[PDB]
């Protein structure tokens, strides 16, 4: 597979119609997964499945600017399961990142970082076996 944490360069940043596909398997007894769409040290889009926050499963999304986290967006729909293979599809649209897991729409995240062409790296981390990480223009 791939070494986690994994850096996928996004040459020239992201743009509407860019689809990022992450294939992996959640480890047994997982605690977290994280996708970090970065603009230098800033995180434009943090996607953070938490498997045990006060014995609840929740996806936390956020943006980090100048090393400060903003206001969390929280989603209780939680399609991930410890031990199971997943596919995460992040489609860049004009106003948001659109996320589907296992071919089912999960959430959207409004663009806070406006310079989409400077979001030039995706960090993939947490309790997964990472199989593949790629992008295509649709
Ligand atoms: O707001 C998101 C942010 O939340 C805090 S609690 C975590 O330590 C960070 O890794 C990140 O997930
Ligand atoms: O201290 C509690 C908070 O810390 C920052 C992040 C939040 O999700 C939460 O974990
Ligand atoms: Mg298991
Ligand atoms: Mg999918
Ligand atoms: Mg900006």
Swiss-Prot record:
Binding site for a beta-D-galactoside: 69-75
Motif Nuclear export signal per record, residues: 114-129
Compartment(s) of residence: Cytoplasm; Nucleus; Secreted
One Gene Ontology term of the molecular function aspect: signaling receptor inhibitor activity
Keywords, alphabetical: Acetylation, Cytoplasm, Differentiation, Disulfide bond, IgE-binding protein, Immunity, Innate immunity, Lectin, mRNA processing, mRNA splicing, Nucleus, Phosphoprotein, Repeat, Secreted, Spliceosome
Subunit structure: Probably forms homo- or heterodimers. Interacts with DMBT1. Interacts with CD6 and ALCAM. Forms a complex with the ITGA3, ITGB1 and CSPG4. Interacts with LGALS3BP, LYPD3, ZFTRAF1 and UACA. Interacts with TRIM16; this interaction mediates autophagy of damage endomembranes. Interacts with cargo receptor TMED10; the interaction mediates the translocation from the cytoplasm into the ERGIC (endoplasmic reticulum-Golgi intermediate compartment) and thereby secretion.
Any single GO BP term: negative regulation of immunological synapse formation
Part of the full-length chain shown: 113 to 250 of 250
Tissue: A major expression is found in the colonic epithelium. It is also abundant in the activated macrophages. Expressed in fetal membranes.
Main location: cytoplasm
GO CC annotations on file: cell surface; collagen-containing extracellular matrix; cytoplasm; cytosol; extracellular exosome; extracellular region; extracellular space; ficolin-1-rich granule membrane
Identification of the protein by name: Galectin-3
Domain Galectin: 6-136
Location of Phosphoserine modifications: 76
Highest rank taxon of the organism: Eukaryota
Described purpose of this protein according to its UniProt entry: Galactose-specific lectin which binds IgE. May mediate with the alpha-3, beta-1 integrin the stimulation by CSPG4 of endothelial cells migration. Together with DMBT1, required for terminal differentiation of columnar epithelial cells during early embryogenesis. In the nucleus: acts as a pre-mRNA splicing factor. Involved in acute inflammatory responses including neutrophil activation and adhesion, chemoattraction of monocytes macrophages, opsonization of apoptotic neutrophils, and activation of mast cells.
């Amino acid at each position: 597979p791939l070494i986690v944490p994994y850096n996928l360069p996004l040459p020239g940043g992201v743009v509407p119609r860019m689809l990022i596909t992450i294939l992996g398997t959640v480890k047994p007894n997982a605690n977290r997964i994280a996708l970090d769409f970065q603009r230098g040290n800033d995180v434009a889009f943090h996607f953070n499945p938490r498997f045990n926050e006060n014995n609840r499963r929740v996806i936390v999304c956020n943006t980090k600017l100048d090393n400060n986290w903003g206001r969390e967006e929280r989603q209780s729909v939680f399609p991930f399961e410890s031990g199971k293979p997943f596919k995460i599809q992040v489609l860049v649209e004009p106003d948001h990142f659109k996320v589907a897991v296992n071919d089912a729409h999960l959430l959207q995240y409004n663009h806070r970082v406006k310079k989409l062409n400077e979001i030039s790296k995706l960090g993939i981390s947490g309790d997964i076996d990472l199989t593949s990480a790629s992008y295509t223009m649709i």
